[PDB]
């Protein structure tokens, strides 16, 4: 799936907003922030990252269509 992670500046304590693109009919996805919130039960092909510490972060996602899925893996760099 495509890693669409739209957001403005990512300073310590920012809410980035992500979204995956591939399994058109997405009703649920599972991201992985790792910023305190590891597993991420998001709806459809969309979610958002809540970064609160100044440093770097790693992102991943699992698409769930019921009979199909997708693997996501983005990167993040939050400052302060």
Curated annotation (Swiss-Prot):
<protein>
    <recommendedName>
        <fullName>Polycystin-1</fullName>
    </recommendedName>
</protein>
<comment type="function">
    <text>Component of a heteromeric calcium-permeable ion channel formed by PKD1 and PKD2 that is activated by interaction between PKD1 and a Wnt family member, such as WNT3A and WNT9B. Both PKD1 and PKD2 are required for channel activity. Involved in renal tubulogenesis. Involved in fluid-flow mechanosensation by the primary cilium in renal epithelium. Acts as a regulator of cilium length, together with PKD2. The dynamic control of cilium length is essential in the regulation of mechanotransductive signaling.</text>
</comment>
<comment type="similarity">
    <text>Belongs to the polycystin family.</text>
</comment>
<comment type="subunit">
    <text>Component of the heterotetrameric polycystin channel complex with PKD2; the tetramer contains one PKD1 chain and three PKD2 chains. Interacts with PKD2; the interaction is required for ciliary localization. Interacts with PKD2L1. Interacts with PRKX; involved in differentiation and controlled morphogenesis of the kidney. Interacts (via extracellular domain) with WNT3A, WNT4, WNT5A and WNT9B. Interacts with DVL1 and DVL2. Interacts with NPHP1 (via SH3 domain). Interacts with BBS1, BBS4, BBS5 and TTC8. Interacts with RGS7.</text>
</comment>
<feature type="domain" description="PKD 1">
    <location>
        <begin position="1"/>
        <end position="80"/>
    </location>
</feature>
């Amino acid at each position: 799936a495509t890693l669409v992670g739209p957001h403005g500046p990512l300073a310590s304590g920012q809410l980035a907003a992500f979204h995956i693109a591939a399994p058109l009919p997405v009703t649920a996805t599972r991201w992985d922030f790792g910023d305190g919130s590891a597993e991420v039960d998001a709806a459809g092909p969309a979610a958002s990252h809540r970064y609160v510490l100044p440093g770097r972060y790693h992102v991943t996602a699992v698409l769930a269509l019921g009979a199909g899925s997708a693997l996501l893996g983005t990167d993040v760099q939050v400052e302060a």
